[model samples]
Target: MEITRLLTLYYEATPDPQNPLEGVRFGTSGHRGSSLKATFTEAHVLAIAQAIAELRPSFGATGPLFLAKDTHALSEPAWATALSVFAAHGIEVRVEADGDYTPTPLVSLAILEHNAHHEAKADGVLLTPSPPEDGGFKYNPPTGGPANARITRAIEERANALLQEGLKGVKRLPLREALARAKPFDYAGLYVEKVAEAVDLEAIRASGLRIGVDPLGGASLRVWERLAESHGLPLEVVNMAGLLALKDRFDLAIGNDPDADRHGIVTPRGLMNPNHYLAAALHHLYTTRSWPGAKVGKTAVTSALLDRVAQALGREVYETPVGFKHFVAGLLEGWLGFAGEESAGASFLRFDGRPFSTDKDGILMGLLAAELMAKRGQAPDALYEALAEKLGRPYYARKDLPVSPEAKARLARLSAKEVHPSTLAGEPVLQVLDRATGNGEPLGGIKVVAANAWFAVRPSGTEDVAKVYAESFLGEAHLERVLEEATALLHKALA
Candidate 1:
């Protein structure tokens, strides 16, 4: 096998008494392990797909399964194996008509569209390698939604079942032939529909919002073109097909990976600081839209500006620990009308109260900005500025810190036994929450809250490192200080 290496990643195998596949457990992000570990090998993909085929009921009358793979090197191979297994099991498979990578949201939209038009319910599986740094297979159910706790639990159980059964029942196939059979569709069309549902597409097109959508050369590129063409809107799709050609884009502008789950927005003004300022703009959009019963969903690490926005809007603020998975529960529950994270991930309810997708949708969110501007007659930057004035401008930053596998356990423990400090950075620590979620669900992180500044520290999901995310409304100087102190506190806990 000719293996490709993009970057060096560390992978270790744990002792498995139950089976040879040790440390193959799925994280909150799905089946995330390492390819180099052999635990995440080609056999694993075939077995997992076989398990799904054997256990999960097949959709009838529903269209073929819409499969999407990202730019990760492992993803292409894993994807090929997954296809053969699905085909061997007599499951029909589909792909982007152009044989391009589809974003997670686009796959969800495809499944939803198929189900809506057909009596049989159709669903999808997303093959995201999560970078070598974060290898995983994430699933989105047939409803074009995230796998709720129930669905994930089922997949997890079936996967372990394959292990206990010693992979005897798993169907195996040739990887080469499978790659030849997979079909691709114009997935960009599905993106257009989903974006319209999430944002005021009609109004935006009618009003002609001067929108610039940077797909980061991911799945959203074609979607944006269709969006502009279909809606007849004045939309400029920046970085149109910039996958390999736009070299200087990242330096002077922004960059995009294949799937487009991560967004990179740039204006004539400057490259937008994704986490802080984008979060601020997102909060403004949700509040200004004032969708009845609409609330803000944020990860624990998001800036405090979200809290202030929620307060001012008199909206319910639902806090997830981190990851789009946590934010998903609120969106599914109808309580979290709008949910966003500091990592440039967010999703909101449609006008009719249904999820566009449980996954982070850059297309939908980008379109939402356009709709807001067209309807409100103002650009996203201006709206953000107005919001900053009211809620107090906040600067934020996140960094990864090294940790031993041993320290990972200690960090979780520290989150549970948090002690309060009266002051931090010369300000009173108003609330020290180990877990801010109402249930006190051991969030595996700590959040230090001051008057107008807050920060969160948690271990990376796929790496043995703690990540510190901090924000301060007191400007750039305070922002730096908060990050410094926040890192120290987290380090102290680890020690």
Candidate 2:
């Protein structure tokens, strides 16, 4: 199979030490690349793993390091490589019990639970996909979230330095000894318990609603089956189009991205948009949970309908720049009750108002959709429509514009001062922002807000294009105008 060669290249390929692009570098989440380019080969994992071990002591991560992987082509190979290094360093490492796949949320929760119960603080490393087709290695600190910029940059520099030194300082054991030394952890089963605590699975079981789940071969397959078998819910842990073909037979259908960090929800109406479901989730969570003062965490470019929903519920909205890492501290600190992005990535606190996972729990979000259906007697799409009936419905869309490298860099370093627009789509501009409104961090782009329409321009992390997210409460015509004006603004700025 082609994937077999992918694995071979991963283990045997060597990156050129002189080519810095082939070395370790952390983007928003992790050091990411495909093995085909030698950017994420065995040497990269070895150097990155050793750098992680070297930095942990100074970071005060003295407890066991939880390691997990998705079903990516390169994940298992990299996971073993990291294990060899950790074992050689004599650092306690945790892995899946049966070498099965583990989702991102499970690893985050395990670290948090371990740190909460033990005196020592635990952290984690996820061998997930960067672009879902490539390899990625991300560090989750003791806070059970993405390592902050300071820590990740330290790791990047040290890993690259190690690569430059011909990996002389990286200690690694043979695979056999490495696998023997690592202990197994219950990522699947524990996540089932955690999801039940965060969502109303019992209510779902009692409500007699059937759920159809397509994990897209992500790590959630195990957890989904466990939830079904344990909770006795009428759930098919499996199909989308097939279920839609027999839509009348099932109450709801759910889909998750490969790593199970993002969701694709299908209500009775049809496949629900992430923005629509995000609004429904926030409205349902805030209204149901008794955490009175907790706020909703959202990306700045998410649908403005969510802001209206938050206001209608008398709840506040904490807007961050694009990236789930931006919402980590808020969710971890219990200030944000539910954190999510427009791309269908989301997680909420437990019923008792404590975080189950700061990382986006796509599995939890799916169960919450079921819970929303059972309790409200309405599918997520229906609930969102009801919300729109009371609150004004908004038009939201995100598009990618190809640009030159210089223009992309200019967009990345764009400041509010660079944008001098007085109005957008014929409406007076209200705010021009270069930083996140909630935390005051550089947004890496700019957001120009009008009363009824707004647009944000930022450099895409994984592509040579600019991602423009815009929303208009003023119907499709105004939304078209917003897009046109926003594109014109970018052209003028770039020129």
Candidate 3:
């Protein structure tokens, strides 16, 4: 947990053939683990970088590699390790200007911008672990999106093999030499200057409303401060470095996670639920933006309120499993205008109906909250209240149930045909789905839909727990029944 220890241990830990520290696993994000466990140490990153260097040629990517890191404690060591390997392979890399932290979306934007102007396609490597304070390395191909499973699997296997071999074929350069070879790019400046395209900056400035921001000691701290100075607004930067409570003075408040890939919105009513934000954001974007005929994407665990919003707007919903990468192909093709996970990560197209970033952008979501208040003259909570009134108010809750790894895997592999529940919350079962309705992709779990209630059961990709998501349009009691029945059915199915 100490920065000094992480840096020192980076050079001390050596990979061995029979060690957990030498293992590599790619989750929904990239390869992420604790440096304290030695899994995210120098050897892991060096092998990963060398693997990518070998695969880049086959991908037909010949342009510069955009390299960025967040504010995590271990991110620096891994960032330095990857850079040294990249530089040793003679791959041109770009880092943040003046040693500034780079947010995840900014790296995606850079890759897209680079490929748009240059004949040679550019890819990027972002060293971040989303909201958590761990080390991660995500590789974005020339498409400016998270690489698909095939690409990540190939790279992961190669990196693991290299680690098993004690990194015999991995190349490395001195830190000084790597720093000398890497170029500096202005990530925050470029992203902030072009932010007006996605958010209504002028309306926010003209509203004369007080805005408060708590970056939570994240990568978005400097970006928001610079954005406030550039726009000349009445903005307050709340320091979360030390735990402090908020007063009821600000009109709108926003917060972002460590790597600035997920957002939290605060109103005078306190922090709004992420589901409410997603629904409200969907309503606002569809009504304001010119992305006509574009489909919306949401995870199966996301609120059905989003489906209501999309249906009202004459749009379809593309439901998928619980990963932001599932929405990548849709966003890149410009058919999915906006995609969000229940955990508060989302991204959308620009105002003119062009793709902005395939990955989730926390900074964009925060700005969108301000834009909604400025343009509609109401906070996000109030807007959500209005939407709930129009669309039937949904009672939703999610809880995790601890289970054996064997049972969790069985639940994840359950088929729709195996779910023979006759009724849910006294309503006849309407549909049992094990695949997404939008693109027919495997849901990795089962979803039971009733007339006025529905529930989904899925295993956590990173934990030994099964997650139950239930929603009822009837009442809290009905929602409870749905949850109870859902858990019962899952247990029976696993048994």
Candidate 4:
């Protein structure tokens, strides 16, 4: 669809009672839908804002509601819609002082800072379809992280119920009045200063490394510049940010997806894989930092390289399901010093062993690459090589296989006991897990572990397929065999 067409539809389309823009759909993050499809119209935001307003009191959240948005095309209008509802409900809201795009972690940090001092707890709503596809509204309770499944389910049902009633109970003020009601917050300045405690700007500045960043037309476009100016570092912002060869002057090239949550790294060796970076980052953080006995958090589909890194450091590994939200509690409570996903989103604790951000902070992760280079005098790609030398190199890949609704449902309910395979590929099946080993939460799929390889099979949440993620420390050939065997095993089980 053309941008102009979507823009025109967003501004002109009226809510149709007959269609009702698909019911409120909440995923691991929050509700997201395209305005052109009527899924993210003004009515949806209004209903969601009202539902949050009504539910906050029950959570004892009586303070200001921190509101933020990313650089998505529809985020601006959705922001206005949400503000009107919040203001009409007499709920105080906070917005960026400069009216600039705010990163996801900044919102989480703002909530934590507010609730730390005030008896009345504060919560936040972020209106950004991160990575820029549609509009997204994610709610962070007083806990300063993504709301758990129970809370999200509650909000989803209530919001859908409100939408079905034609938003009769949703109160909203005019856009002007709602904007006036918002308090100006120094989101940028505070977040910049706070992030330094987690990352060492002094070391990076001392190294005189040439750093390149591509904000990719997302929220942190200006923040990267601000960081360079404030920290007195030689950081250059660029475009077309992806995996690039490390040529002459550019030491590293960094990229962040639309909302500045997912990160991409480019070096002389080419774009480093997300799993490779995670392994290198885990090793660097655990070894250099003073957080002894801190647990490492990773998702099931993440590379097992991190498992070896953590074990080598004499630390425990906590593997969760597919979502970053699962790492929220561990991060906020300081139990998991580092939380990362295979998708390139990660966050860590402050220097003082305190939580930094509960949500994924691409800005932080990008800078961490520079920090690794400065302190270790080696690029992340080289660092990964060293890690691979010490701990065996691992090969990982994920692909989707078609499935029926019945098969998908069966996969969700599938247990380790049901998959009675004695061997996989050439290795004996060591363990089969329907739940994560770290917190014992349901993986929504099954994971099979062998001696040198492992594979996790889960049904796609948004597609008519199953996702098979396999990793092998043996080699590329072994990795393919694992995939082949895993696909056969899962398909047989489904049949």
Highest lDDT: give the candidate number. 4
Report the lDDT tens digits of candidate 3 across residue range 328-402.
Answer: 888877889999998888999888777788788988898898888998988888989999999878899988888
Q: 259-282, model 1: which lDDT tens digit per residue? A: 656555444555455554455555
TM of each candidate vs. truth:
0.82, 0.96, 0.95, 0.96
Off by over 4 Å in 1: 1-23, 32-40, 58-64, 113-120, 132-136, 148-166, 173-186, 206-214, 237-256, 276-284, 287-290
For residue 290, model 2's alpha carbon misses the true position, in angstroms, by 1.0
lDDT, candidates in the order shown: 0.65, 0.84, 0.84, 0.85
lDDT of 3 at 143: 81
Question: Which lDDT tens digits does candidate 4 get at residues 253-310?
Answer: 7888777878888886678888899899888898788876679999998999999999
Clashing residue pairs in candidate 1, if any? Answer: 95-184, 95-185, 96-184, 96-185, 97-184, 97-185, 123-142, 216-256
List clash counts for every candidate, in order.
Answer: 8, 0, 0, 1
Candidate 4: segments with Cα more than 4 A from true spot: 11-21, 239-248
lDDT of 3 at 74: 76
Model 2: weakest 10-residue lDDT segment is: 239-248
Q: Rank the candidates by lDDT, best first.
A: 4, 2, 3, 1
Q: Weakest 10 consecutive residues, lDDT, candidate 1?
A: 6-15
| Per-residue accuracy of model 2 over 1-495 as CA lDDT, tens digit each | 578878888988888988766778786679878778877899899999999999998877999999988888898888989989998988899999844788888888998888888977888999987354688898999889888888888999999899889899999999899889999898887877777778888789998888888877677788888888988987898631223334545688877765687777776567887889989988988888898678888888888888899899898888998888888888888899988888678888997878899887788888888998988888888889999888988898778889988888778767899897888998899999998888888887899998878999888876779888889988998899999888888988987
Candidate 3 whole-model C-alpha lDDT, 0 to 1: 0.84
